Structure 1
Amino acid sequence: GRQKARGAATRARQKQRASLETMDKAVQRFRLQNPDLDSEALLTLPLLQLVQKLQSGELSPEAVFFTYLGKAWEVNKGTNCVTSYLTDCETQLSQAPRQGLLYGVPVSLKECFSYKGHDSTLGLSLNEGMPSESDCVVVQVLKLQGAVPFVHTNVPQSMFSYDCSNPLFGQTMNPWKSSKSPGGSSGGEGALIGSGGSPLGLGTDIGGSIRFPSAFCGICGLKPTGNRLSKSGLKGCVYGQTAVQLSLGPMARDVESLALCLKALLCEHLFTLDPTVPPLPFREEVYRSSRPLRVGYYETDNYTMPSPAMRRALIETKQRLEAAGHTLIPFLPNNIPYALEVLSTGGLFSDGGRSFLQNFKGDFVDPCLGDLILILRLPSWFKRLLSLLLKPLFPRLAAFLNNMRPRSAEKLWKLQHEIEMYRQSVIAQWKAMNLDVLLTPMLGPALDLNTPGRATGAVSYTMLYNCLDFPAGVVPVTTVTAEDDAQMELYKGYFGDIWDIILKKAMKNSVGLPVAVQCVALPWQEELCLRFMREVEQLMTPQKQPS
């Protein structure tokens, strides 16, 4: 019984095809009216300068919108990042509040951000042909700030993946190399922004979904503290799981864009539309601070062996920060294997994967999901038995499998309490070293298509911060050299299990691909996190800022 799944894919593909055709027509209509417009100059303007020219009236919102729309349509040809054109955006463009902080800015949205009249399929047949009836809160706030949300971008099926394919819209490809994943689950956003088709987008992240596509595609991304921004109207395939906090955040070409997006979102409109969000205004003085920092750092988490490019990106950033007067302090959050295997894995799959699996009933399982669905469908007794068998040779595989078993509400409370204690334990470590921020490696270079689903272990660098619920962002700092890439032949991983074997092959053939570092601060310290990211970007890529 795959006719239901086939029908949904046929309809989704027709809608995506019609969307792209509508974009093409609007772009051609505009271009014939504006032949002298310097499109390349407008497309390469950093967001801050684009916003200033829109606010002064130097650039019209139409020129900006239609030029980006044309670029999005062009880059989509080689990336397949766009699932839907938000058709009513041209009416929003004419009504954009003039004094809005993002006036005339086209914004791309990950498919899960509910947008009136459009599906949020998550690549699942069960959600095809069920359009949203209202804009989610952050979309309402973007519009109230004069921004023009224009496209829905692709996600891997269900979003529980750092790849970017689903049976409805297909596979999104990295704009730097077609054989590579753009990362995920905000992969469509990573590919679109990374190829210049959008100056700003929004993604979501429970295990690294903003950070993986930002790093793989060579753009900046911030995952705030879970409750810094409204999650009201965000479509997900599992609800009520609170142990591992989901967060939403900006993705863009530079750090200043992330800070402007955060400043525009953290306004009275957001706080009144969603009173559950603490009304914490963006602290400009914290973001703009030039005071020296006490930077904790690690070159490896001893769980996922860093690629030679990751290790060099980290070491070089560390050295530039030291030369700039910051204090670099070795720091490693305690019990990383326990935080990932017991707390994160157990938090995400407390019910054995039953709630998640309901979404796949009668659907195709995208190959980019690997054996995740097959593994989760196993009876609890069998996950326990197979875990006992795997334990002596492959303890990491045994530990994940054992922690993907269903449990009682009593055991969930115990797990939730352990998450709270673990959070305080890392805060205590941080305080004992008097850190301001933390610098870590970020997974990269981009993995080959269809390999993220077979290298689960590699979520270690990002997922730890969803478990801890700390703001964490990524900044591109270097590109893979042939030297770094040849060095992948000596890569063994710490465990030598299937995930390490996959990761070794998957990170090969990555010359010229972007590589990032991750910047972290304590809960509610997004402005300090961004101040540090701004520092990293300035020291490693000085051209990206006013020079």
Structure 2
Amino acid sequence: TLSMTLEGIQAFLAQGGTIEQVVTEAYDRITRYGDKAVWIALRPREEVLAEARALDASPATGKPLYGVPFAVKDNIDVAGLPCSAACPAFTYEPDRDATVVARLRAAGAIVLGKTNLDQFATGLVGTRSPFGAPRCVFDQDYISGGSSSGSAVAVAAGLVAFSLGTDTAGSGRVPAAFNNLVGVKPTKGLLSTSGVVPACRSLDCVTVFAASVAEGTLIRRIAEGYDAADPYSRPSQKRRLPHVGLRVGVPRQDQREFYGNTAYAALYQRALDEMISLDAELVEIDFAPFRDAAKLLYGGPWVAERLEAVGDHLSRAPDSFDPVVRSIVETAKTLSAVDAFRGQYELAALTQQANAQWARMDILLLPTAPTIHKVEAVMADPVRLNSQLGHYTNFVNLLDCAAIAVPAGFIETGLPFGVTLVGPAFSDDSMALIADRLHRRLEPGYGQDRASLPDPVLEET
């Protein structure tokens, strides 16, 4: 009767259970789950059992994650397992663990394996894998989100205790809203991209899907650290927030788009309807400079970082690509450095305008996605429909912001609604607090069953 959380695994072990049983159970849940599209490479049971055993003999000293099972987006290098980024021809077999996998496996955590993703981290839908679309936990018709699709599913279903996503567009925040989870997006640089296939290399962040903020946070702190081999790695600053007097920018009502979702529109409002019983002071801000900057990521020159990354393969084997992703990268070929530099000129401008709005607010509260689609709707509007989801997300890394997505409630169809809390760089540890108190105010439950929330609860410092 296991609870697949950090706390939930502490207790199973504190009461005569074994890591070996945990892995056996996890592999039971997996073999039964029946969304065929969560995994690209599961380990041999007897590979994971033999290392479970090896851990049961060890002390749990200096192991904050003793015997904890977790999943890894198949764009993050786990050794022993091949890495494909959902592009079979792109497949390779890493000799070494990505740093943040190394840092985590040494805290005692175990990998069952590589989850499905939107190919090359180019999407927000989960539909762009040859291994197929994962689906929401609450309705097989509806998309898991993207691009870290099978990684949110795995935690929400209860196959694993946490997963590792990656974020550039919204890929570590949108899947978290669609499967009722906490999605932590760290300031870029806090976590190594060493052993991560690059998407938008300057922007990519390694993220954490978890059951609570407190556990996404802790897993972050273990994975967080300077990596000299990561040119874009940054040593941890630690700027903080007020919690007495805290101001919370929301967009203007005209600047509050939902693309026809009445429902989410009513539910985002509900966040503000339950947020008044909070020590959260409201501010109405100009959302344009974020909206407009969010557009630069695909509607600008940045989409060409992806071209540097996969470009060789695109000339070696352009058919081996997801047709959609393919249509997106092949148009970046037309982009010149004039275009590119011009794009940073607009970014610098919007940054000024952004910093203006950062004066009126202490943090940003947004609909993680304005809506959510049926899989078949996006098999037929694979582009326009996928872009709608990046309406409140795509500006976050470009503007050196940090974010945390949390469950925010449910609509009549039984589909969830997640909000994201966006904040300035390195405000991670104190923004994390606020995202707990709010999560525990709106939908104090996680995952497939809106399961009860693992203690501890976050308390200030």
Q: TM-score range by the shorter chain?
A: 0.7 to 0.9
Which residue does the alignment assign to 1:416? 344
CA RMSD of aligned residues (A): 3.1
- The 2-side partners of 1:424 and 1:158 are apart by 32
Secondary structure, aligned partner of 1:134: coil
Which residue does the alignment assign to 2:155? 193
Secondary structure, aligned partner of 1:135: coil
Distance 1:292 1:52, change over 3 A: farther
- The 2-side partners of 1:414 and 1:258 are apart by 37
- The 1-side partners of 2:433 and 2:10 are apart by 20
Please tell me the residue identity of whatever aligns with 2:408: V
Residue 263 of structure 2 corresponds to residue 332 of structure 1:
no
Which residue does the alignment assign to 2:40? 83
CA drift at 1:223: 1.4
CA drift at 1:97: 6.5
Distance 1:166 1:337, change over 3 A: closer
- The 2-side partners of 1:191 and 1:453 are apart by 23
Unaligned runs of 5+ in 2: 445-451
- The 2-side partners of 1:81 and 1:444 are apart by 24
Secondary structure, aligned partner of 1:182: coil
- The 1-side partners of 2:281 and 2:305 are apart by 44
In the TM superposition, what are the counterparts of 1:366-377 in structure 2 within 5 Å? 366=322, 369=324, 373-374=326-327, 377=330
Which residue does the alignment assign to 1:307? 261
In the TM superposition, what are the counterparts of 1:437-452 in structure 2 within 5 Å? 437-443=363-369, 445-450=371-376, 451=378
Secondary structure, aligned partner of 1:469: coil
Larger radius of gyration: 1
- What is the CA deviation profile of residues 14-68 of structure 1, one whole-angstrom value per residue up to 9, with x for unaligned ones? xxxxxxxxxxxxxxxxxxxxxxxxxx3x136x433433654x5754222222222
Residue 453 of structure 2 corresponds to residue 544 of structure 1:
yes
Query: Which stretch has the larger CA shift, 107-116 or 449-458?
Result: 449-458
- What is the CA deviation profile of residues 451-488 of structure 1, one whole-angstrom value per residue up to 9, with x for unaligned ones? 1534123311111213223111211121111xxxxxxx
Distance 1:60 1:352, change over 3 A: closer
Residue 27 of structure 2 corresponds to residue 69 of structure 1:
yes
CA drift at 1:443: 1.1
Equivalent pair of 1:92/1:143 in contact (CA under 8 Å)? no
Which residue does the alignment assign to 1:50? 9
Which residue does the alignment assign to 2:449? none
In the superposition, the TM-score normalised over structure 1's length comes to 0.72
Equivalent pair of 2:402/2:424 in contact (CA under 8 Å)? yes
Count of aligned residue pairs for this structure pair = 435
CA drift at 1:216: 1.4
CA drift at 1:405: 6.6
- The 2-side partners of 1:374 and 1:281 are apart by 39
CA drift at 1:292: 5.0
Distance 1:126 1:539, change over 3 A: same
Please tell me the residue identity of whatever aligns with 2:87: L
In the superposition, the TM-score normalised over structure 2's length comes to 0.84
Equivalent pair of 2:70/2:162 in contact (CA under 8 Å)? yes
Which residue does the alignment assign to 2:71? 108
Which residue does the alignment assign to 1:294? 247
- What is the CA deviation profile of residues 475-511 of structure 1, one whole-angstrom value per residue up to 9, with x for unaligned ones? 1121111xxxxxxxxxxxxxxxxxxxxxxxxxxxxx1
Residue 151 of structure 2 corresponds to residue 205 of structure 1:
no
Please tell me the residue identity of whatever aligns with 1:427: N
Equivalent pair of 2:371/2:389 in contact (CA under 8 Å)? no
CA drift at 1:540: 1.0
Secondary structure, aligned partner of 1:204: strand
Equivalent pair of 1:262/1:282 in contact (CA under 8 Å)? no
Residue 235 of structure 2 corresponds to residue 254 of structure 1:
no
Equivalent pair of 2:169/2:297 in contact (CA under 8 Å)? no
Equivalent pair of 1:124/1:166 in contact (CA under 8 Å)? no
- The 2-side partners of 1:354 and 1:138 are apart by 23
Distance 1:444 1:375, change over 3 A: closer
- The 1-side partners of 2:393 and 2:247 are apart by 21
In the TM superposition, what are the counterparts of 1:493-532 in structure 2 within 5 Å? 511-532=413-434
CA drift at 1:231: 0.8
Equivalent pair of 1:473/1:533 in contact (CA under 8 Å)? yes
Which residue does the alignment assign to 1:346? 300
Equivalent pair of 2:291/2:395 in contact (CA under 8 Å)? no
- What is the CA deviation profile of residues 332-375 of structure 1, one whole-angstrom value per residue up to 9, with x for unaligned ones? 333345313346532432489576555443425546x3xx5346
- The percentage of aligned residue pairs carrying the same residue is 22
- What is the CA deviation profile of residues 504-538 of structure 1, one whole-angstrom value per residue up to 9, with x for unaligned ones? xxxxxxx1011111111111111122112101111
Distance 1:156 1:352, change over 3 A: closer
Query: Which stretch has the larger CA shift, 250-259 or 325-334?
Result: 325-334
Please tell me the residue identity of whatever aligns with 1:202: L
Please tell me the residue identity of whatever aligns with 1:102: L
Which residue does the alignment assign to 1:36? none
Distance 1:115 1:282, change over 3 A: farther
Secondary structure, aligned partner of 2:121: coil
Which residue does the alignment assign to 1:21? none
Q: 1:425 aligns with which of 353, 364, 385?
A: 353
- The 1-side partners of 2:80 and 2:311 are apart by 27
- The 1-side partners of 2:333 and 2:289 are apart by 21
- The 2-side partners of 1:72 and 1:227 are apart by 33
Which residue does the alignment assign to 1:459? 390
Distance 1:340 1:275, change over 3 A: closer
Equivalent pair of 2:187/2:205 in contact (CA under 8 Å)? yes
CA drift at 1:330: 1.2
- The 2-side partners of 1:191 and 1:119 are apart by 21
Distance 1:300 1:474, change over 3 A: farther
Q: 1:470 aligns with which of 392, 396, 401?
A: 401
CA drift at 1:158: 2.4
- The 2-side partners of 1:104 and 1:365 are apart by 37
Distance 1:414 1:526, change over 3 A: same
Equivalent pair of 1:83/1:153 in contact (CA under 8 Å)? yes
Distance 1:50 1:421, change over 3 A: farther
- What is the CA deviation profile of residues 385-441 of structure 1, one whole-angstrom value per residue up to 9, with x for unaligned ones? xxxxxxxxxxxxxxxxxxx5733334423423432443343123212x1x2221111
- The 1-side partners of 2:374 and 2:210 are apart by 23
In the TM superposition, what are the counterparts of 1:105-254 in structure 2 within 5 Å? 105-128=68-91, 130-165=92-127, 168-236=130-198, 238=199, 241-242=201-202, 245-254=203-212
